[PDB]
Amino acid sequence: TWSPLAFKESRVWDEKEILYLGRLADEVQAGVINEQIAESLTWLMARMRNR
């Protein structure tokens, strides 16, 4: 016989980071976290490969 395994994990972002997130050098508006979510997205994509 044979039986598979299950692998899941979560990742959250609270209000204070999703509202207050600019950069360091520039006076950039608060829409930076919508670019930073894609990094954790492709990181979970690359982390399911490592199992």
Binding site: L19, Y20, G22, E27, V28, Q29, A30, G31
Partner: protein, 51 residues
Amino acid sequence: FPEDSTFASELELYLLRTQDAEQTGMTFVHQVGSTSLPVEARVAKVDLAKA
């Protein structure tokens, strides 16, 4: 207080104060047939401000 809108959280006003060298002084009095004499040295200042 007429209202205003922005997309970012904190508000920084950077003031650049400037004390230019005031154009003062009278031209030196001399007699015709003489080598001239030079003028004094003057000072300008720059200060900044963060709010």
